[PDB]
Amino acid sequence: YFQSMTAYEMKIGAITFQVATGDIATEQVDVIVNSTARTFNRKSGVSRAILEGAGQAVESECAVLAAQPHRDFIITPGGCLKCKIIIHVPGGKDVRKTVTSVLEECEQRKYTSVSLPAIGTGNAGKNPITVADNIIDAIVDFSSQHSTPSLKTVKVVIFQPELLNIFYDSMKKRDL
Amino acid sequence: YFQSMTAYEMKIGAITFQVATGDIATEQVDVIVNSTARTFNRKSGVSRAILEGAGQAVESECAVLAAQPHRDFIITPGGCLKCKIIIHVPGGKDVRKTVTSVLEECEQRKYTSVSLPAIGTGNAGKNPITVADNIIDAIVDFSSQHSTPSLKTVKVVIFQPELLNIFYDSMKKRDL
């Protein structure tokens, strides 16, 4: 027997923003985000959960894309994950900028749902208050620039339950 | 354009407890709760939304059941609502007791989901802090008495957004 918060949701313009405890590998959405090394050669923390669930093909696709010229992120299909593409981002880079780019990729490909982890709050060592604020900053910016987007649902999947209430505190500063 | 909290969720034992802004008439669950007069002869506030959406048949069923002997509540089918039964409860009675009975009816009929309004916080004039606490008290009691229930999902649908954060405050006192 146990008692604890598991999810918070808010509406920001046309966008539903969700923060919930989970394993992002179980997600059934258009786009899943992987937070990884600059070189895309990591299989530990959230990258382990994603690369193992996605399968070997995705993993080999990553090694190809990594050794040829690329944006800050690379994109692969989902493999055995119940998603269409995976966007692999470096967890050490500016999170607001990373999430703004993720959201813009989603929109331009006409995807409707994206789930991401708490980027940078594991091995990257970034301060989790700042990371929640940055992710929220990026969603508010995107929403304020798009009054009728295809991307309607953004979720942060939280693995460390301790971060759930950090994310709530940052959400609540926006609430009316 | 606008920004606001819309949903909170927690786990209490085997039960998922959800509080979200909404019109309970749109709910697609096993059991919907109607908060009404002792005589079950009300069509105003949440009863209006429910009786209009359910249809005339449900409404006439209610008048029959009301004029013959009954428990504190009566039960009808859902009509045109996307639910199997409606449990009509008096919003002026002890809320903890009312919700304990609702939950016990759900379990014994092997239903899996129930949605209810903020019982008593409209025309009944009950204090909404106390009502949230009472509803939560009842869920914790039921959960602590049932380690493997059929009833797995309980939702409070909130129409007055102001009550959303009252419900959160009562939930957060249980969180670990």
Ligand SMILES: Nc1ncnc2c1ncn2[C@@H]1O[C@H](COP(=O)(O)OP(=O)(O)OC[C@H]2O[C@H](O)[C@H](O)[C@@H]2O)[C@@H](O)[C@H]1O
């Ligand atoms: N299954 C999971 N589902 C969702 N989130 C998870 C899961 N597993 C762990 N997390 C959370 O995922 C969050 C991120 O933890 P990490 O996987 O270390 O990624 P990073 O972005 O910090 O660092 C990645 C690289 O980036 C930098 O360049 C550094 O060099 C790093 O090597 C944590 O909250 C985990 O608890």
Ligand SMILES: Nc1ncnc2c1ncn2[C@@H]1O[C@H](COP(=O)(O)OP(=O)(O)OC[C@H]2O[C@H](O)[C@H](O)[C@@H]2O)[C@@H](O)[C@H]1O
């Ligand atoms: N569509 C809706 N969906 C969900 N909740 C709603 C909706 N519409 C209103 N509400 C909320 O429903 C909540 C309850 O408002 P009321 O329908 O007045 O029911 P009561 O239980 O207070 O009083 C019912 C009788 O009981 C006593 O005996 C008294 O005699 C009353 O006459 C409020 O928060 C509404 O905003």
